[PDB]
Amino acid sequence: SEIHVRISDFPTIYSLRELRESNLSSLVRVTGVVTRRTGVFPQLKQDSNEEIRISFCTNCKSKGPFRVNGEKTVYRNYQ
Amino acid sequence: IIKSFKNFILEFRLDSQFIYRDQLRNNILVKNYSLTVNMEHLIGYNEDIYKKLSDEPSDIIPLFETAITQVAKRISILSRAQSANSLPTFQLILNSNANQIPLRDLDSEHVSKIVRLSGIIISTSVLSSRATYLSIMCRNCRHTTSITINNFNSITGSNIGDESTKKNCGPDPYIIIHESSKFIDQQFLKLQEIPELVPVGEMPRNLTMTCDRYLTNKVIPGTRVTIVGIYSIYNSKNGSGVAIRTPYIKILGIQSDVETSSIKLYEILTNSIAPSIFGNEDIKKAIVCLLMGGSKKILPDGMRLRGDINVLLLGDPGTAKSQLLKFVEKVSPIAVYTSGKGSSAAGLTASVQRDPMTREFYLEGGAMVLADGGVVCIDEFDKMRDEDRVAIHEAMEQQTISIAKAGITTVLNSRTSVLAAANPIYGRYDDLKSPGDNIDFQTTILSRFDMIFIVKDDHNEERDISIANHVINIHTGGSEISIEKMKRYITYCRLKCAPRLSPQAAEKLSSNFVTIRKQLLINELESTERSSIPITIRQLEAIIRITESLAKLELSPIAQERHVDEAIRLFQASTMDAAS
Amino acid sequence: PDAVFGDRVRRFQEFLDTFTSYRDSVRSIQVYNSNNAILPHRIIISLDDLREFDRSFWSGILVEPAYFIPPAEKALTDLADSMDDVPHHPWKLSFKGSFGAHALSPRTLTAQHLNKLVSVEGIVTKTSLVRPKLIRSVHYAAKTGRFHYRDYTDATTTLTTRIPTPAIYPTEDTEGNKLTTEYGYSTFIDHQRITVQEMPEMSIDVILDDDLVDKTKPGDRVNVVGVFKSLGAGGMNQSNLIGFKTLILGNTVYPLHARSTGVAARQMLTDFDIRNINKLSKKKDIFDILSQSLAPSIYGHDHIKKAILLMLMGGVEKNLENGSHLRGDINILMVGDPSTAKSQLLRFVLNTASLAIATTGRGSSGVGLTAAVTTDRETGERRLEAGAMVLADRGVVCIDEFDKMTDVDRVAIHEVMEQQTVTIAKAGIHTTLNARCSVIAAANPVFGQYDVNRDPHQNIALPDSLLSRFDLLFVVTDDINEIRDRSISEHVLRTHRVTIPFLRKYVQYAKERVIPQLTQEAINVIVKNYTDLRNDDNTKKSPITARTLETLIRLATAHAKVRLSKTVNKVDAKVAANLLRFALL
Amino acid sequence: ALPSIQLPVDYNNLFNEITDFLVTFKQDKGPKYMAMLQKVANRELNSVIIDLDDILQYQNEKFLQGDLVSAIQQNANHFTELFCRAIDNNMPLPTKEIDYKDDVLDVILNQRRLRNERMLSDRTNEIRSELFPPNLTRRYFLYFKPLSQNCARRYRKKAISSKPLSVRQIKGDFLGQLITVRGIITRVSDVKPAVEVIAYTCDQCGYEVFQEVNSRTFTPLSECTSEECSQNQTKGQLFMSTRASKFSAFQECKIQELSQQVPVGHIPRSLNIHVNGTLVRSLSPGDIVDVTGIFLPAPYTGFKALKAGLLTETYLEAQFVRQHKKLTSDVEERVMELITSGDVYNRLAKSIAPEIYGNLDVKKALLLLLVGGVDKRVGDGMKIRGDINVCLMGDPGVAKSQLLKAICKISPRGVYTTGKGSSGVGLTAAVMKDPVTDEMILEGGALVLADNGICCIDEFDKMDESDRTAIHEVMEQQTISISKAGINTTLNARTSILAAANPLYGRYNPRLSPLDNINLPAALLSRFDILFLM
Numbered sequence A: 001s002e003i004h005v006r007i008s009d010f011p012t013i014y015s016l017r018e019l020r021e022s023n024l025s026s027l028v029r030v031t032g033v034v035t036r037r038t039g040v041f042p043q044l045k046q047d048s049n050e051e052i053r054i055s056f057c058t059n060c061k062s063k064g065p066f067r068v069n070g071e072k073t074v075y076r077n078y079q
Numbered sequence B: 001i002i003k004s005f006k007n008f009i010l011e012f013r014l015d016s017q018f019i020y021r022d023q024l025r026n027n028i029l030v031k032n033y034s035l036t037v038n039m040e041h042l043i044g045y046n047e048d049i050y051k052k053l054s055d056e057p058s059d060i061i062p063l064f065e066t067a068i069t070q071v072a073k074r075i076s077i078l079s080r081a082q083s084a085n086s087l088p089t090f091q092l093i094l095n096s097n098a099n100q101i102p103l104r105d106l107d108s109e110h111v112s113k114i115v116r117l118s119g120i121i122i123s124t125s126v127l128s129s130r131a132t133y134l135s136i137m138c139r140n141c142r143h144t145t146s147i148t149i150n151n152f153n154s155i156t157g158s159n160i161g162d163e164s165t166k167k168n169c170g171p172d173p174y175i176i177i178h179e180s181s182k183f184i185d186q187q188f189l190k191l192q193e194i195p196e197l198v199p200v201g202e203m204p205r206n207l208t209m210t211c212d213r214y215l216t217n218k219v220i221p222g223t224r225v226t227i228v229g230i231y232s233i234y235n236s237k238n239g240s241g242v243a244i245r246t247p248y249i250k251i252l253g254i255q256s257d258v259e260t261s262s263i264k265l266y267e268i269l270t271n272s273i274a275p276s277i278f279g280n281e282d283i284k285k286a287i288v289c290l291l292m293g294g295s296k297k298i299l300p301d302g303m304r305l306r307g308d309i310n311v312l313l314l315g316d317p318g319t320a321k322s323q324l325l326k327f328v329e330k331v332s333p334i335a336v337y338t339s340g341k342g343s344s345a346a347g348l349t350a351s352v353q354r355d356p357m358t359r360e361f362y363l364e365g366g367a368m369v370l371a372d373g374g375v376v377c378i379d380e381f382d383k384m385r386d387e388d389r390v391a392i393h394e395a396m397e398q399q400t401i402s403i404a405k406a407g408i409t410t411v412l413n414s415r416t417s418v419l420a421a422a423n424p425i426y427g428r429y430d431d432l433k434s435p436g437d438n439i440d441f442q443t444t445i446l447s448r449f450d451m452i453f454i455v456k457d458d459h460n461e462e463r464d465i466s467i468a469n470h471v472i473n474i475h476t477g478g479s480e481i482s483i484e485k486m487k488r489y490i491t492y493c494r495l496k497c498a499p500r501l502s503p504q505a506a507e508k509l510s511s512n513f514v515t516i517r518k519q520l521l522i523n524e525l526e527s528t529e530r531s532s533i534p535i536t537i538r539q540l541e542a543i544i545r546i547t548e549s550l551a552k553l554e555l556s557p558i559a560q561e562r563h564v565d566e567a568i569r570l571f572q573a574s575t576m577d578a579a580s
Numbered sequence C: 001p002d003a004v005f006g007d008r009v010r011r012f013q014e015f016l017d018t019f020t021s022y023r024d025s026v027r028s029i030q031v032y033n034s035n036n037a038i039l040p041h042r043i044i045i046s047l048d049d050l051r052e053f054d055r056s057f058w059s060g061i062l063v064e065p066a067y068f069i070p071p072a073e074k075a076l077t078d079l080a081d082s083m084d085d086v087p088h089h090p091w092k093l094s095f096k097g098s099f100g101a102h103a104l105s106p107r108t109l110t111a112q113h114l115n116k117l118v119s120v121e122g123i124v125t126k127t128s129l130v131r132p133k134l135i136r137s138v139h140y141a142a143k144t145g146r147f148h149y150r151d152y153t154d155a156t157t158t159l160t161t162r163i164p165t166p167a168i169y170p171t172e173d174t175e176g177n178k179l180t181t182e183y184g185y186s187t188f189i190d191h192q193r194i195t196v197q198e199m200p201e202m203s204i205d206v207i208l209d210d211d212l213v214d215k216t217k218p219g220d221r222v223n224v225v226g227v228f229k230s231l232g233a234g235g236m237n238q239s240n241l242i243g244f245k246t247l248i249l250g251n252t253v254y255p256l257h258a259r260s261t262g263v264a265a266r267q268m269l270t271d272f273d274i275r276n277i278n279k280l281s282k283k284k285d286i287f288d289i290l291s292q293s294l295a296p297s298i299y300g301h302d303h304i305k306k307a308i309l310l311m312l313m314g315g316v317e318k319n320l321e322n323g324s325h326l327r328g329d330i331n332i333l334m335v336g337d338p339s340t341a342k343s344q345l346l347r348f349v350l351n352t353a354s355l356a357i358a359t360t361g362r363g364s365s366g367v368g369l370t371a372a373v374t375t376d377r378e379t380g381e382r383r384l385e386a387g388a389m390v391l392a393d394r395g396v397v398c399i400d401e402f403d404k405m406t407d408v409d410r411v412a413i414h415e416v417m418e419q420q421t422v423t424i425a426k427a428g429i430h431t432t433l434n435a436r437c438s439v440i441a442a443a444n445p446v447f448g449q450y451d452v453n454r455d456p457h458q459n460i461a462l463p464d465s466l467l468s469r470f471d472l473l474f475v476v477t478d479d480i481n482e483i484r485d486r487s488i489s490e491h492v493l494r495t496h497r498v499t500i501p502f503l504r505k506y507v508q509y510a511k512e513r514v515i516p517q518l519t520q521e522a523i524n525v526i527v528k529n530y531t532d533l534r535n536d537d538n539t540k541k542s543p544i545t546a547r548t549l550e551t552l553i554r555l556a557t558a559h560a561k562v563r564l565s566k567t568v569n570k571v572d573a574k575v576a577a578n579l580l581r582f583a584l585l
Numbered sequence D: 001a002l003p004s005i006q007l008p009v010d011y012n013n014l015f016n017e018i019t020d021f022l023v024t025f026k027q028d029k030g031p032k033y034m035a036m037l038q039k040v041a042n043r044e045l046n047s048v049i050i051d052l053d054d055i056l057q058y059q060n061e062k063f064l065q066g067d068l069v070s071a072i073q074q075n076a077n078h079f080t081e082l083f084c085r086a087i088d089n090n091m092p093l094p095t096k097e098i099d100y101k102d103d104v105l106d107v108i109l110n111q112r113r114l115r116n117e118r119m120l121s122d123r124t125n126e127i128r129s130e131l132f133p134p135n136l137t138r139r140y141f142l143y144f145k146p147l148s149q150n151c152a153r154r155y156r157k158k159a160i161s162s163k164p165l166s167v168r169q170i171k172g173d174f175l176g177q178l179i180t181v182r183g184i185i186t187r188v189s190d191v192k193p194a195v196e197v198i199a200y201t202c203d204q205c206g207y208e209v210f211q212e213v214n215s216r217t218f219t220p221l222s223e224c225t226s227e228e229c230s231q232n233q234t235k236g237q238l239f240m241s242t243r244a245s246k247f248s249a250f251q252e253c254k255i256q257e258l259s260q261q262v263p264v265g266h267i268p269r270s271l272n273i274h275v276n277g278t279l280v281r282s283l284s285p286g287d288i289v290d291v292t293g294i295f296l297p298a299p300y301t302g303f304k305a306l307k308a309g310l311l312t313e314t315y316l317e318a319q320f321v322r323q324h325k326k327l328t329s330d331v332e333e334r335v336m337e338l339i340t341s342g343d344v345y346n347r348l349a350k351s352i353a354p355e356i357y358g359n360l361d362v363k364k365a366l367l368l369l370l371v372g373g374v375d376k377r378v379g380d381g382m383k384i385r386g387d388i389n390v391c392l393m394g395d396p397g398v399a400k401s402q403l404l405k406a407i408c409k410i411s412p413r414g415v416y417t418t419g420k421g422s423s424g425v426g427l428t429a430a431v432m433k434d435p436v437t438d439e440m441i442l443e444g445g446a447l448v449l450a451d452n453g454i455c456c457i458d459e460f461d462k463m464d465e466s467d468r469t470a471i472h473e474v475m476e477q478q479t480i481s482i483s484k485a486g487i488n489t490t491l492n493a494r495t496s497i498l499a500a501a502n503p504l505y506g507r508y509n510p511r512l513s514p515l516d517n518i519n520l521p522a523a524l525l526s527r528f529d530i531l532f533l534m
């Protein structure tokens, strides 16, 4: 369906004890140990993936709550 | 095409007779609504709609239903007027014995495809229902409509379950009445491919299944069954069950003998039960009679004659439980792969599971449900928790297991010998203490147990010298009447058999026990170091029943002396060894 | 209206008018109701005579009850409000007394029978509260009267669909003034959709309407017949797509078989069966062949076979006026080789005889042999857990592996037996549950097989009362010579290759046909016999407890019931005292 | 459909019946109606209990000169409507003098009424040239006492009203009938003020609006309908005022069965009761009491989902209470028969255990126990238990368990158990700190169940003497104090204890003295009164 690339190696070896806001959204290579893991998630990812932003998409929007489903939505393999 | 097909189903007549009309008329009155019509008829009587059915059976088998119930009318209502209003319609049971396609098909091209599919089922026979003709009255327009879901026999178990909400003053004007709307409770079963099959494809294979009126508990283990392949779908989950391609099916479920629908060889077995295995003639005879089955009798008495109740075959790895389990499984229908405390996705006493197929607690079929036919093999046997010892003991005492938990109280039937083994504690402590002692020693657990054993594989003296080479081993490094054929002889002895034991060898066994007790009542003057001369009275009848099975090996209605005397000698060697 | 309802009305009118006896019975109970200045008027009817008269009515009833029954309701309402004009009452039918023979196991009542008359037999456990739900409502317009009636036509009504539209509460309807309600005048029909469970000896909600309120106790396999229909809301229009509710109606309640044991036995007799039983009983010798009828694998200890058949007879348990019903049933303890003695002697009562819930002691206690107060998260409410034995009624429960009892169990045996019923005063509740069942116990020798060798002092580690509290105590032999083991071998081989079961129809027969209440001569015998007992064998163990004499009645009195003799013979008493000498020696 | 099915019941005819049904009566000598309406208008009373005896007497007088019960057997509340509204229509005003500082809520509502009356006869008159609900002027709550069987004796009628029936006996048609039921009170909450006439002041539009209290679920009504700010584009919002409105006490409780009215099968059933008006705080948990009122389910769905149905809850609207055990009737006449029949003492001593002969003496003691019936609440000091604690000793041959079945079947309220049947906390009491209202729930300790009854006990030897503390506590009768798990309170059990024990050595030890056979430490015997070793 789609291909994503992977990169070989960086010289940047920022240890977990060293990460700053300058580094965020950039590339980082870290060591460590997998403490614990989960299973596959069908993550959510006019509220596309908000479920907290509903302006006037409700019939009883004053106080009567409208309920959205959590399905029919795109699912990304997510561990 | 409707009239031609209505007539052609009236003409459907396999090489027997017009049985599907007379037997129909004579079967509706009590139970058999729609006779199982084996589908060797369509391949010759109408090849055009045969291809149409092999291409699009979705909207055609409802025409099968309509024409078969219409001729059922034309006959049974005529006989009613000759003998004594609506005659509720039927859901026919159609499949063939040829053109086999197991679950080797999984692709999306199989929307509306019927194939003569065989395959095993494990569990999840959950029950639900869908309507046949849907009655929906409108409240905001007063519009009553009896619109069917557009079929009764090929319903999902292409029908989408919406109801076209009309003029929207109210959130749901069209409302369902389920009294006037007729429905059918159809059980949502599951489908797996036979694992004992030479043809294998698409290793991940799984589909749903439906049991409409009497389709439940009609397939038994080890039979070559003929069910419907696959049906269209109200699309399943997508990123239920497995995600990808999980359709609801419309299976009809014909089941018969493997080869049919309504429509001296032993002298080579002196060693052939063990093509490569070595010795242990007692345990190996136990294994061959385990593959046999023993005695089963229902005739008037105050019990039922049991066979091969229990064995404590605990032994070390090296015995290669791999080959034991694999050969027994290849010969047995389904080797019950019990893992200590658990039977299948639950404990020995089956545990209920809340399945989202019904979103409710259904009794997950236990290993025991699948154990009738095959010998339970308990692996991971040593780490089993003592909390359910009496549970298995009770099963051992009778056969079946009485599972009585929240919502489900049933004595689920189980009928086979046992298999108990794991790596013994303290290494080879079994040598010092009793042949038992793979698990806890307390004499109370041992009470209901019957026979204990030790296994001899080709590594005994590796404990003195060869161990050196052994670690150096890490550094520097069928010929028998086939498995299916033994299963065939076994099913043909389950059919009918009377190979009972012989009185002379019976008195010979009685002798070689009682005269032992007399020699030892005389040798009590020697004050033997044997602790307490036991009553070998259940082991004795065990030997009797094993000689009975060795006679079943030879069909003799009065046991031949060969097998009986061999078993006598070997089991006196075993019992004598135990006494030692 | 359409002509089909009128034709059905006429057919049912003719059917009921054919049997004017039932008409007059209804008229009589109804004029009694009037003179009492009422009863839900559904009539106990049998669909058998319909085949003699109704050929289309009966044809359409079973196939589609919702079509032909509501006429059998309307026409009855008319014929009865004509039969009675005096007072100012459903006038329905109850269908009780027909041969349905459907849905043997309620696990599959849905598959075969759809929209049809369905019988189901199953235990009634966790009966829900009564729901006196209103359907008929009456109201008053704040001004000028206008007393408005209302019939709550809904889907939850008895059988027919009645447009499930919310008409819960009208107010100020048809008039601008206010509508007050009027209670009491408006009826409150007993909507009690009780949870009746399945029947394992082979949890649908049955709505018992206005006359079937709590007709059976917990532990009753009720043969309830209803109309399997479906209704309700599941959410196939909103966001929730699931199916809908299926449910059986309530027409007939044939409860657990009252006089004899539960519904399962059904040991009625035919003229051939009555003649075989008579030809048997009148013969003095049959009492002995019963031993062969109870010695399939083991031989010897035929006295134990006699004990088994006696405790199968039932006893003469008598209900004393203004006092406790005396215990006339017997419970026999067995102890011997845990390997062979237990298995063999058990396998009759377990598999063959009747109503013998296998009880291992600690294990088969399950949740609890006696009872337990359980407050569940499911309804968030506390019910009882009645043990199988106390769930049992009239049976003979088998308790193997008796020496494996939990400590708290050790007291139930006193109340379930010597007080004949299990009364519990536990957390927040106190109730006297019925446990009136004979007991056959089999106890393992707590140390191997020395129960025979070791004296009974602390032998099973329970000499004080638990030994004697069981009425009779039997022990098999352990040390045998060539001859007994040889006969064992002979029989085990001749079996590994004289009606035993039929006797069941023989047993119950007696306990309902003839009863040897007592005889003064047998009294004169047994009383002096027991004086000799309590004067002579005192030095042994002093089991001379007067309770034993009670058994000396029970035993002998069941014997003559097995004998069918209207009298308790003096030599019947001889057999009794010799059975006891056997049990003692 | 929408039927209007005429039934013989009506209100306008009942209205005229009420108009004639006034104060006028003879014994009720000034009619008790008159003097009691004075008393309540002299403000020293609010509960005008209107029994059913004088009702049938007024009916008899009206009939001999020229049915009400059969009418109240379905609603009983439209009668409280008409009857009370006419007591308002016929209310003595000048009963006594009036002050301004003699009370509260009687001068204040008169101030409101008469001042808004001045303001109306002035403002609507200026325009020329709301309706104060009767509840607002109640100041009393009226109730009805069921008639004694005396009237049904002379005039048999629908006597089911005064016939005490169990809660099990409540038929689907009995819903709405004035029914007297007996049992045991439990879980009676504390007094809660519930509003009756909800007031609403605007503070901008002046008009004090008064709405009626619906089912427990109600709504604070929306923007005013007052005309002061209305008829323009403006409207001042209203809001409630506790002083302006009116409240009344409210309580709940539940009732369980006498334990001799339930079959040997099913579990006893509870039943809600909403105590209202001045009848509050006159109740308590654990008293044998005949409570009477109406039986109604109120309409309310729990999940508030779409489908309503009818989850038939219930409540016995407390119309009257009779707490028995603080007769001159046929029962007392038969009592005289008994006292005359002679030998009554030894008579009962024989008729007790009338299935067994012998051991007369122990049956004598059991008679003495079951009668009991003495006490000394010395006043300003030590109470003294006037109950009996008799114990046995013997072997199965004595059949003492049969004697116990006998007695605590013969004793009302009696209960049976064994020594090991119930653990320590099981037999004494188990308390749960209810999280909902964070209150105290007592879950049926054998003993508290045993209050005002005889506790049969078997196997008292094996009762795990660590558990002997509870019983030992019982010698100090009608006080079981428990201070654990955040709860430290007492629960009284008026009980007499009957025990059944065994010599430790089995049958008996002749070689050893008494009290060796009897392992019980003397601090237990001394609490017992009679020991019968057999």
Ligand SMILES: Nc1ncnc2c1ncn2[C@@H]1O[C@H](COP(=O)(O)OP(=O)(O)OP(O)(O)=S)[C@@H](O)[C@H]1O
Pocket: C418, C546, C547, C550, D355, D356, D357, D358, D393, D394, D395, D396, D397, D398, D399, D400, D401, D402, D403, D458, D459, D500, D501, D502
């Ligand atoms: N005077 C008597 N009249 C009638 N029956 C008696 C008499 N004395 C003893 N019995 C019988 O004795 C039997 C024994 O009763 P049990 O309840 O077993 O004795 P018990 O009450 O348990 O004594 P304990 O508690 O073991 S010391 C009863 O079933 C009675 O029928």
